[PDB]
Write an enzyme that holds these catalytic residues in place. Structure first.
Site, short mmCIF file in Angstrom:
data_model
loop_
_atom_site.label_atom_id
_atom_site.label_comp_id
_atom_site.label_asym_id
_atom_site.label_seq_id
_atom_site.Cartn_x
_atom_site.Cartn_y
_atom_site.Cartn_z
N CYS A 258 -0.47 3.07 5.84
CA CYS A 258 -0.01 1.85 6.48
C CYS A 258 0.30 0.87 5.38
O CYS A 258 -0.15 0.97 4.24
CB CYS A 258 -1.05 1.28 7.46
SG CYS A 258 -2.63 0.73 6.74
N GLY B 159 0.99 -3.42 4.45
CA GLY B 159 0.90 -4.81 4.77
C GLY B 159 2.29 -5.39 5.06
O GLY B 159 3.30 -4.95 4.53
N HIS C 86 -9.49 1.80 -2.66
CA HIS C 86 -8.11 1.49 -2.36
C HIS C 86 -7.45 0.63 -3.47
O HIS C 86 -7.30 -0.62 -3.36
CB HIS C 86 -8.09 0.80 -1.03
CG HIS C 86 -6.74 0.61 -0.50
ND1 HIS C 86 -5.83 1.64 -0.45
CD2 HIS C 86 -6.06 -0.51 -0.13
CE1 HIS C 86 -4.69 1.19 0.05
NE2 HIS C 86 -4.79 -0.11 0.23
N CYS D 285 0.80 -1.24 0.00
CA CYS D 285 0.00 0.00 0.00
C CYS D 285 0.83 1.29 0.00
O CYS D 285 0.37 2.34 -0.38
CB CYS D 285 -0.93 0.01 1.19
SG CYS D 285 -2.16 -1.31 0.91
C1 COA Z 1 -14.30 -6.68 2.94
C2 COA Z 1 -14.36 -7.24 1.51
C3 COA Z 1 -14.12 -8.74 1.55
C4 COA Z 1 -15.76 -7.01 0.93
O1 COA Z 1 -15.73 -7.16 -0.49
P1 COA Z 1 -17.04 -7.37 -1.43
O2 COA Z 1 -17.35 -8.87 -1.52
O3 COA Z 1 -16.73 -6.71 -2.98
O4 COA Z 1 -18.28 -6.61 -0.70
P2 COA Z 1 -19.77 -7.24 -0.56
O5 COA Z 1 -20.73 -6.96 -1.94
O6 COA Z 1 -19.73 -8.72 -0.21
O7 COA Z 1 -20.32 -6.46 0.73
C5 COA Z 1 -21.35 -7.02 1.55
C6 COA Z 1 -22.44 -5.98 1.71
O8 COA Z 1 -21.84 -4.86 2.37
C7 COA Z 1 -22.38 -3.72 1.72
N1 COA Z 1 -21.66 -2.46 2.03
C8 COA Z 1 -20.38 -2.05 1.84
N2 COA Z 1 -20.22 -0.78 2.32
C9 COA Z 1 -21.41 -0.40 2.81
C10 COA Z 1 -21.93 0.83 3.47
N3 COA Z 1 -21.19 1.94 3.71
N4 COA Z 1 -23.23 0.81 3.83
C11 COA Z 1 -24.04 -0.26 3.61
N5 COA Z 1 -23.62 -1.39 3.02
C12 COA Z 1 -22.35 -1.51 2.62
C13 COA Z 1 -22.48 -4.07 0.25
O9 COA Z 1 -23.41 -3.22 -0.45
C14 COA Z 1 -22.96 -5.51 0.35
O10 COA Z 1 -24.39 -5.60 0.27
P3 COA Z 1 -25.12 -6.94 -0.27
O11 COA Z 1 -24.17 -8.31 0.13
O12 COA Z 1 -26.67 -7.09 0.44
O13 COA Z 1 -25.26 -6.86 -1.78
C15 COA Z 1 -13.33 -6.56 0.58
O14 COA Z 1 -13.77 -5.26 0.16
C16 COA Z 1 -11.96 -6.38 1.18
O15 COA Z 1 -11.14 -7.27 1.07
N6 COA Z 1 -11.73 -5.21 1.78
C17 COA Z 1 -10.49 -4.86 2.41
C18 COA Z 1 -9.52 -4.31 1.38
C19 COA Z 1 -8.13 -4.32 1.94
O16 COA Z 1 -7.81 -5.11 2.83
N7 COA Z 1 -7.28 -3.44 1.41
C20 COA Z 1 -5.91 -3.34 1.86
C21 COA Z 1 -5.84 -3.38 3.38
S1 COA Z 1 -4.32 -2.74 4.07
#
Ligand code: COA
Ligand code: COA
Lengths: 390, 390, 390, 390
Positions: free
Chosen positions: A376, A378, A346, A87
């Site tokens: 930050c 990883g 991100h 990152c």
């Molecule tokens: C967390 C993570 C697994 C989720 O990814 P995703 O599968 O594309 O997200 P999803 O569609 O499954 O999210 C689940 C729900 O949360 C919801 N959601 C996300 N942000 C939201 C918010 N602010 N308000 C309401 N709902 C929200 C989505 O709309 C989704 O709704 P649904 O399942 O009823 O359709 C993924 O984004 C991730 O790995 N994030 C971390 C990234 C990271 O680690 N970056 C580097 C770190 S140093």
């Protein structure tokens, strides 16, 4: 030596499998290299090297940074390379570009990062064959970008570790997340991402689509929807898809030269790079990396925390963003004034130069003299850079 | 700022799917990091940053450079990152290490490269899905390592382009290939790779195997066996598997600090870094990169070509090594005296540091005062570095 | 020995990645097995063996026929097996069932076919490993289902071969494909598929869903959307998506026992099997095989072609389907009266049972004394069977 | 009716990834089809149909039985199909062929089975796409061949269950295994397999190799080395790699016709098929299948167990083989006299035609009148066949 950032640009940040679903990172990088050049009044023939952070280049071919440079008309006589400090990459690339100039090896550098998380492939080592039994096709985005190599768990789990150590409630994380969305929405509607964003034309078959808005930002984001989400990494945890950043695509860059060179050319720079730092921390709490890195960068600049007029501190997760803000004690009202990565997204290797873009354009807009950008990283690292306006 | 190479080490270079067929690049790096530290009398606690070139990280997890550092006992408070300028990477990392010291950002750096071509995976972008029909699993070593991104053809075809422009017969190339084998064999038998090599223990269920010899070197290599081979890339061509380098695994590194820091510690360094350069050329004749790079490196040092006592010029292909030698005009008897990559192999991201290792230990043993290391680079670049003994 | 089909049932035919996108064949098979048992009033424990045709079993586990049988409530004592005569597999399984009973090897058989073209995976032989280079992941649905193993081309190319020899214009094939659409749209709305279909419950997560309609039938089909289609196999061709059958899912079966038995169990049967046959022809013109197959079945019965009052003749293509009609010379107003596979779908391993179901329930409906079901088979074969209603 | 086996042949049984590592099943099948034609003095143009058991056909293309048939010179006018009853298939196809002649549908059949477990691919369902995450590449050999569909564990786990019920110690199983190896070494060295084996020429790039010897048979197998092995499925269990059969490739066939035809043509058949039977049992203890199958076959033949002069009863595992023998009470000294599958190997779809070959030729050479071949079947079935010398 005094190095300035003559110009900067970024694409809009695309949602996972969204606007940029089938756009290679080097195409985004090429648009952003063209833009910094245009914005600075510098021709591509003039560029000596292109330096692009990128974490997920599998399947993209030989040194995508060179692809991006060539596509932007940077001459074959220049050079180009990619780098990976996770990152931190797109920010560390800027510092590395500064060092090229400081040691007299180059006069003009374009530095930042680019990432297509969407296009990252699945893989398997198949050379020795699989004589018998099942095997995994591994998602390189998760494996190489998002999973700790020592502990074997997602970056989300390091965020839980930080939530526990700092005792950050679910409620507090959710509020921080809702605030990020709401600040990003307001900045977007007010036009504050216009100056930084260079539009990107996605070519298709039945029509070109111009992409000039950050599509991951959720408008009208409610606390109620945040609060209803299930913990995404620990069943008894606090970190959710809502209070973590996303999986995203984009590129961002800066054009660097000496302060004496910008003056010859009659360029009004976006800022002087006064210091930078990178420091390690425990991988288990990698989200705390910005703490020692910011402190070291400020020490190197001769600045106190209270001297800062604006701050961009990357929001990988609300839990860690909150820990960083608590420890440094800087006024949160000067931090991520236009939202952060929970809302914007991100795109790993581009993120550091994405937030650098946001800082420099807001610094210009508001007349802020001293700013800092920090991320930050990883595996337990932080990177920070101090920028002063001229 | 005067930066020295206090110590250096490399693994043996493994054959493709050979001794290191199932050894991750970072394990090879970790051994080389431990070795430069042991050889310099510097503790791992003292290291500020590890910088490792690596072209083929896919599937290896987050930031393999950090993985190597950690496994070598470098503290969590240090940082580590990866970089990619193709064949130039492992040498470029050394110059980048030099720059961290020169700009006051670090005191002790371990820089070099690592690569496991054997472990490089196959991949396919699968997120949209495959509703119907066959799709390609893509070899990342070929795609990301050996195929030109602009012309779509192998690095081998760029060798043919150079063969044709320089009028380099098949017989000339084969003689050069046989000579590289026979020189490498003689150096190996006489023990001249012992000092540079750190043995690597390949851990196995049914027994540990210590690997301390370059296994790609062919003993008793004949002209007739070169002469019998079919062109590998063009059917009326001249470049073969025999007169090209191979696909190989290894790591190589250098420990850097200031000249004054080495004096304080009582270290007799292997060399002072006097200059470095990287320049681009046409991707179609990428093998010619060493020509402008070496000339620019020499100019920065204030040296004539005739001032060099020893040269390591990387042998990606006989065709290009021959062209480089012809244009530079340096005495061939001081070039690759212990053989070159055609014999020793070509572990891409490691290559530049491998040749540096070979340069520095031959310079020490023969008492050579001035040396130069250079490589060609896919996509049309060269890198070179000038070393003086102290 | 006289054998009778006591009962029969079939799922609706789904479209590709549609109603049964994630439903394993064996589950569709189990619904059918139970449907036939219930329909005849026969207990599962009374069945001696289940014989199911299936072309695309990969990944589905040991002997998916056994899986069908057990999930249907057929006890561990009975036996089950799959077979593969490609497109004729689901009719041939009925002949084989008939055979068990007339040899005195069993009393009661359930016989049909099942197929999940949707669930068919991609695969590659990888035990040897792939030492270097790209390779293909193969669509088993295409490699094993719709590609001639001898010449290497798709079944619609054997349809192009039969169009050139039987001089079928592009206009004449569109006429046949609309007429089948019209006839199946007619049937569906008119309730003629109700009896033969047994509903299947697709267990979702947020909702179960009763599939009881043939969802590959296109409502209101005209010559225009037909005659604006591009040839799918040649470029100067006359075969298209709309005058060929589809990729589909489904299962289909019959409950067999002896005539005397059905009378003991108070079962009025759907038909007696009087004859059947399979013949080979040139693989290049595989759609020709129902001609010799239908003559042989008809001669084994001691019948004539003019004796027939009802005929199912499988439409894999509109060129092959028009060819069987023209050569055999039967009245096409008794041929696929409720529409054909172009409209309904071509679930390979199930096709022949499917068309058996339609023939049996439609015969029962109108009062037709004599049936014939027949299918062409890739690799150059035909299968046929003659039915008398009692 | 009276059907006889006019002739029979089988390839050698190859070791997993051994002699037939890259030989398709239908190639082995083709050679065995040509053999039974030649040995019977019947021309290929006379064969009505080819019926081959095959359990792992993924990726071999359309109906591999028609591919073995056409390559064997069987004309396009014949028919061909494959069938799957797992380990029973190869013997079951023979009873299936016999049924075709008994019901006047054919005069001449070639029947048996084939298998290349070496060439069985890995697969995944990939149609929807994989938006995020690792996914599994499933070994169809293991999934479809060796894993119980209901309980989800290996066949060798069913062997543990059987060993427990029958109280069959580790020593008892190993004693049976070493005897089986030793019996087979003896048959091999004394040329008892020469008659039934037809050599197979593996065509290659650097030379043709002729394979005419079972390579899986262990020379000098001793109790003491058998005893040194670890349990392969249960870790406090008794079933080992030493006392279970292996993973193998081969093909096997028999040419069937009526006894009156064979007399017409002056052929001396290898046996009259007197009976056959298949029965189901609990899959947990699928290895008991040969018990009801053989007892039901013998009831159909009107024979007592003591009327048998020779028995081939498949040794999928020493635990179930020993159990089968104990129940039936036949003299062990006539059971698998030339050794069994533990020694020879277990090429699944071909196993049953393989042991049919073995029994027939031994019946001929010792002058045995009455014979039985039986196998257990995953998913809980047994199959058997009774054979009388003419
Ligand atoms: C967390 C993570 C697994 C989720 O990814 P995703 O599968 O594309 O997200 P999803 O569609 O499954 O999210 C689940 C729900 O949360 C919801 N959601 C996300 N942000 C939201 C918010 N602010 N308000 C309401 N709902 C929200 C989505 O709309 C989704 O709704 P649904 O399942 O009823 O359709 C993924 O984004 C991730 O790995 N994030 C971390 C990234 C990271 O680690 N970056 C580097 C770190 S140093
Ligand atoms: C040239 C290349 C495509 C050949 O592929 P390969 O599969 O590794 O070829 P091999 O090492 O197996 O050589 C083929 C045969 O020649 C023989 N052989 C290899 N090198 C030989 C030599 N130097 N002299 C005589 N015979 C040789 C081998 O024993 C082998 O035997 P065979 O006749 O039984 O097949 C590959 O090595 C390559 O890409 N090299 C260049 C890598 C590169 O481009 N690096 C960076 C570019 S800037």
């Amino acid at each position: 030596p005094s190095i300035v950032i003559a110009s900067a640009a970024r694409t809009a940040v695309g949602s996972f499998n969204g606007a940029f679903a089938n756009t290679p990172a080097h195409e985004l990088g090429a648009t952003v290299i063209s833009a910094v050049l245009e914005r600075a009044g510098v021709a591509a023939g003039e560029v000596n090297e292109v330096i692009l952070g990128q974490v997920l280049p599998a399947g993209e071919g030989q040194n995508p940074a060179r692809q991006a440079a060539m596509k932007a008309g940077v001459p074959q006589e220049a050079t180009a390379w990619g780098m990976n400090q996770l990152c931190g990459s797109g920010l560390r690339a800027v510092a590395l570009g500064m060092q090229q100039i400081a040691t007299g090896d180059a006069s003009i550098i374009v530095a930042g990062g680019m990432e297509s998380m969407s296009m990252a492939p699945h893989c398997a080592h198949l050379r020795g064959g699989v004589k018998m039994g099942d095997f995994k096709m591994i998602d390189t985005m998760i494996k190489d970008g998002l999973t700790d190599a020592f502990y074997g768990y997602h970056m989300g789990t390091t965020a839980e570790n930080v939530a526990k150590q700092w005792q950050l409630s679910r409620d507090e994380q959710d509020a921080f997340a809702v605030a990020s969305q709401n600040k990003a929405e307001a900045a977007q509607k007010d036009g504050r991402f216009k100056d930084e964003i260079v539009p990107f034309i996605v070519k298709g078959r039945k029509g070109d689509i111009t992409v000039d808005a950050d599509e991951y930002i959720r408008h009208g984001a409610t606390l109620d929807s945040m609060a209803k989400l299930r913990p995404a990494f620990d069943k008894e945890g606090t970190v959710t898809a809502g209070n973590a950043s996303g999986l995203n695509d984009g590129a961002a860059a800066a054009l660097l030269m000496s302060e004496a060179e910008a003056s010859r050319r009659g360029i009004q720079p976006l800022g002087r790079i006064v210091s930078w730092a990178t420091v390690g921390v425990d991988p288990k709490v990698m989200g705390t990396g910005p703490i020692p890195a910011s402190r070291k960068a400020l020490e190197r600049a001769g600045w106190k925390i209270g001297d800062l007029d604006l701050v961009e501190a990357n929001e990988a997760f609300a839990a860690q963003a909150c820990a960083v803000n608590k420890d440094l004690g800087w006024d949160p009202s000067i931090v991520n004034v236009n939202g952060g990565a929970i809302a914007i997204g991100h795109p790993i290797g581009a993120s550091g130069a994405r937030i650098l873009n946001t800082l420099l354009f807001e610094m210009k807009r508001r007349g802020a003299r001293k700013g800092l950008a920090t991320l930050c990283i990883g595996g337990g690292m932080g990177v920070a850079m101090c920028i002063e306006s001229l």
